[PDB]
Design an enzyme around this catalytic site. Structure first.
Site, PDB file in Angstrom:
ATOM      1  N   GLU A 200       0.803  -1.216   0.000  1.00 20.28           N
ATOM      2  CA  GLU A 200       0.000   0.000   0.000  1.00 20.28           C
ATOM      3  C   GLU A 200       0.840   1.271   0.000  1.00 20.28           C
ATOM      4  O   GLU A 200       0.297   2.357   0.230  1.00 20.28           O
ATOM      5  CB  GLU A 200      -0.966  -0.013   1.186  1.00 20.28           C
ATOM      6  CG  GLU A 200      -1.855  -1.244   1.169  1.00 20.28           C
ATOM      7  CD  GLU A 200      -2.920  -1.239   2.245  1.00 20.28           C
ATOM      8  OE1 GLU A 200      -2.882  -0.355   3.131  1.00 20.28           O
ATOM      9  OE2 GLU A 200      -3.804  -2.121   2.186  1.00 20.28           O
ATOM     10  N   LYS A 333     -15.695  -2.282   2.446  1.00 22.15           N
ATOM     11  CA  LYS A 333     -15.059  -2.829   1.253  1.00 22.15           C
ATOM     12  C   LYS A 333     -16.171  -3.355   0.348  1.00 22.15           C
ATOM     13  O   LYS A 333     -16.774  -4.391   0.635  1.00 22.15           O
ATOM     14  CB  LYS A 333     -14.075  -3.934   1.635  1.00 22.15           C
ATOM     15  CG  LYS A 333     -12.848  -3.432   2.394  1.00 22.15           C
ATOM     16  CD  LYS A 333     -12.059  -4.583   3.000  1.00 22.15           C
ATOM     17  CE  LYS A 333     -10.659  -4.144   3.416  1.00 22.15           C
ATOM     18  NZ  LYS A 333      -9.935  -5.201   4.185  1.00 22.15           N
TER      19      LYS A 333
HETATM   20 MG   LIG Z   1      -7.768  -4.599   8.072  1.00 23.32          MG
END
Ligand SMILES: [Mg+2]
Ligand SMILES: [Mg+2]
Lengths: 424, 435
Positions: A200, A333
């Protein structure tokens, strides 16, 4: 009416295939890419060990081109009626976990249709999503929760939280400047290799304790001159080191002892950390089915407690977490549940219990920027989309900059009220 | 006509500001982002950085953005140039600036407008950008899709250890299609990252600026062996070649005319003349399937380049030597110093001058490798540039980090779109323009 629905394989930020879907209407082509994807919706992978190490998505792509695409066109649903579209997609699949057609196949069509729906309205996607979600005006731009130091030491993510900044644009500048100090600091104290980045975009130095990571972030914030203006958040991702057999958490789960913590002992560590550092949010402090530990921790904690693996953007698990008072924020998500409509329901269910909602990337991301419009459309006031490094992360932040400039005074930065931004 | 031209600051893949330009016409909004350049050193076109040490460490682009919004935009709209006439647009932009290095308005401001206008011109013609660029460059059909040169392992100033060479690339040239070439490279990359973790520790899996791994490696043979092993594990030995960027300007000692292969700290007795360094390249090229070497000698060591050119049957790519500059390309042709150009559009600053640099290289039968920069964005213009120029080669990173993959995904879309009207350059990447 929809004239063409077509999917292809593309590559995500880790170099693995994923599904990209095109939906063509009278307004043009509308495109979405699905990010990478124990209780979450079932992503369909080819499993051919001779191709992409088994990670192909040719079958999911085929399901869009041969089954979903032709069925949805024939059904002729108004692309603005997102709930009707997603109801039809789930009816087409017919399984709870979307294992017939693939959660990646379904979501790709769900998001591309949402962009077609906004375009038929003549509004940006975030405005369409606000309509769908019922969220009030003015628009609220989210606080970027920036994972600048990547782990998983045991803890997975160490984030900076620029909530004091007067605007989203200034918060990004502050985060970018802190990150640059941090990267130099990591190289100085740990060698040139410590400046290389994780999935990330955060630095991943070889460090042992949470206090070491927090000290490095603390020093970077001071070098940048923002001490007291920038808070800290963590994603423990404790499911990675829970040993359910003995009900203990192994903070040294990388080296193959008696240094395993009960959840009361782990809770002591979080409390010590939160009383020393400006930690305002902790994600997955306990394992995905250690409900007793979460409820124990919730009762004493005045900071944000974010469900990720606990809740998997699933309204059924969210209901249980509300009833047991296990957490007070949802990590959202969209590909954990598989449609835009169910993702919005997950958000609204959380808001109904005064939860915070943090719209989230996956560790395998793409150049797609849908979640930036989702975070604004949902008035969540919080987004988690990486360090300010690697463009699958910056693309979302750049999109919010465009939204910010486009909205002018018709948008406000959530700032310090990110936990309650939906009612700001 | 253009109704609106507007610039803003966005962030590049390293977390530094850069310029994004919008151009609005009747066909809609047309957008381009500029990659990171150079505001000092006086080698390439001059990017304009703010230099305010209290903001982005001095790397703001507010002044360049202001130049688009307050100077270039109003002037270009009033000039009322046909957006399809790229040469006339870029001529006007250079006239507005008036400096050889574009240091008045800023190379990043000028290129941003240049590229967004090019997209507007393609849309007025009703064709994708690669087709518009093919028209501008005069390249023939069918279209040629480029071989990806993928920087999967890093050395030099990027990594620790003694490894002096900067970029180690895999070249999937035997694959029957671009789609298959990407799959092969992606699979090799996954093998390589596992090997680096296995042989050098878990931290070796973390990536550098362009998505490759960068463990502490001592020698070039050590790096090439790791890549060789990953190629073999993936089952593609003999189907995938190797390329290198030495970036030898980083370790040239100009006062003594010798190269320091241990410039990250070193014995001056072990320093190499260009003849000794050329011997090392020749040895590596006879042992490994190295088909291309970039910047084997320093940016002004013309004697070394020409000496190396005379004996070498592989591709010799100018990067710092040529800096996408037609004047330095002409010198390199005349002295026979290299046989390929790395094409970085933002090193020269307009699309028209970039296309001219490619044509100038093609006129001497050079290869042309369209290239990314270290600081990239989600913009995919160079994918269309590689296809439109019929270059047959692109250098846009490891298959990791989406500022790299976005270019590769765009070529996947072009490949699917063109069908039989496109061919993959394959083993003919050096001559793809005449394929
Ligand atoms: Mg997490
Ligand atoms: Mg180079």
């Amino acid at each position: 009416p929809i004239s063409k629905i077509h999917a292809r394989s593309v590559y995500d930020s880790r170099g693995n295939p994923t599904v990209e879907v095109d939906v063509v209407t009278e307004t043009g082509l509308h495109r979405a890419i699905v990010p990478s994807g124990q209780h979450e919706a079932h992503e369909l992978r080819d499993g051919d060990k001779t191709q992409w190490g088994g990670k192909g998505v040719l079958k999911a792509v085929k399901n869009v081109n041969e089954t979903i695409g032709p069925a949805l066109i024939k059904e002729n649903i108004d692309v603005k009626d997102q709930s009707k579209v997603d109801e039809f997609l789930n009816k087409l699949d017919g399984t709870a976990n979307k294992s017939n057609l693939g959660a990646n196949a379904i979501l790709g069509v769900s998001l591309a249709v949402a962009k077609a729906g906004a375009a038929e309205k003549g509004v940006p996607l975030y405005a369409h999503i606000s309509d769908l979600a019922g969220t009030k005006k003015p628009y609220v731009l989210p606080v970027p929760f920036q994972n600048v130091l990547n782990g998983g030491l045991a803890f997975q993510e160490f984030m900076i939280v620029p909530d004091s900044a007067p605007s989203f644009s200034e918060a990004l500048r502050q985060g970018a400047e802190v990150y640059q100090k941090l990267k130099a600091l990591a190289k100085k104290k740990y060698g040139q290799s410590a400046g290389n980045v994780g999935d990330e975009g955060g630095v991943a130095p070889d460090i042992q304790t949470a206090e070491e990571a927090l000290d490095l972030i603390t020093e970077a914030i001071e070098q940048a001159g923002y001490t007291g203006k920038i808070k800290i958040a963590m994603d423990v991702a404790s499911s990675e080191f829970y040993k359910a057999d003995v009900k203990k958490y192994d903070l040294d789960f990388k080296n193959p002892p008696s240094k395993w913590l009960t959840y009361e002992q782990l809770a002591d560590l979080y409390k010590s950390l939160a009383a020393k550092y400006p930690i305002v949010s902790i994600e997955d402090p306990f394992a995905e089915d250690d409900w007793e530990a979460w409820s124990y921790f919730y009762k004493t904690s005045d900071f944000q407690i974010v469900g990720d693996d606990l809740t998997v953007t699933n309204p059924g698990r969210i209901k249980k977490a509300i009833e047991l008072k296990s957490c007070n924020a949802l990590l959202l998500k969209v590909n954990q549940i598989g449609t835009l409509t169910e993702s919005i329901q997950a958000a609204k269910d959380s808001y109904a219990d005064n939860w915070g909602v943090m719209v989230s990337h996956r560790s395998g991301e793409t150049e797609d920027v849908t979640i930036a419009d989702i975070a604004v459309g949902l008035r969540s006031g919080q987004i988690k989309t990486g360090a300010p490094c690697r463009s699958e992360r910056l693309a979302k932040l750049n999109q919010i900059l465009r939204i910010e400039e486009e909205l002018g005074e018709n948008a406000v930065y959530a700032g310090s009220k990110f936990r309650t931004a939906v009612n700001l």
